[PDB]
Design a protein around this ligand. Structure first.
Ligand SMILES: [Ca+2]
Ligand SMILES: [Ca+2]
Ligand SMILES: [Ca+2]
Lengths: 126, 126
């Protein structure tokens, strides 16, 4: 499926014991409204604790939103390896339930915290 | 002069009386002669108050840094007019002899605070 792509970054604040998730921008998203646009936003959380969650601002009438946001998760470094970061992109609708675009998951045990990288990943269906 | 370009956003937080400056990324920063890259960072401040200032993190060995930062200036909305935002991109030096790459200035009087946009602007010579 061609659902667009998301650019994000991961870092760990070793001084305050927090995971830092940069949600930078998305590109080439599907148009889920009339007239060729969507109103995208991203939900961000860590599995298995769907507790502590964030979402970006809703960007209106764009398939290439520049979020420029950063989220902070208080999670002990020794426990981070067992977590999976979920970034799920939706189309905000006022007059109906929000339309799923797609998502990407990052198992935290795959992450190198030695240097921050910006990563593009293609969105997937759940 | 082919100095590259900077993507930024401006907004005003009307509930907390703060100017919001997004420093998203830069692109196509000029390649030095011998050493092929730069270590870019951006200084951000509001003229005529040079004292309240911010800087991005330093990004190592890149001509296309993705800063993904947001800065806030406590300034009354009624005082914005006549002020100018400066965004100046430097090549970091360990010993604080930083080299300006280029800059540009946004007079508040040119900004429409009714709608938030991300804008790319070409860097200009000091
Ligand atoms: Ca829709
Ligand atoms: Ca919509
Ligand atoms: Ca809907």
């Amino acid at each position: 499926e061609k659902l667009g792509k998301l650019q994000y970054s991961l870092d760990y604040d070793f001084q305050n014991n927090q995971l830092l998730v940069g949600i930078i921008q998305a590109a080439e998203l599907p148009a889920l409204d009339m007239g060729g646009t969507s109103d995208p936003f991203v939900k961000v959380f860590l599995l298995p604790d769907k507790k502590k969650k964030f979402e970006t601002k809703v960007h209106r009438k764009t398939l290439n939103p520049v979020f420029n946001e950063q989220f902070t998760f208080k999670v002990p470094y020794s426990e981070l390896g067992g977590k999976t970061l979920v970034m799920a992109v939706y189309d905000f609708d006022r007059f109906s339930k929000h339309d799923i675009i797609g998502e990407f998951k990052v198992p935290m045990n795959t992450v190198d915290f030695g240097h921050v990288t910006e990563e593009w990943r293609d969105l997937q269906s759940a």
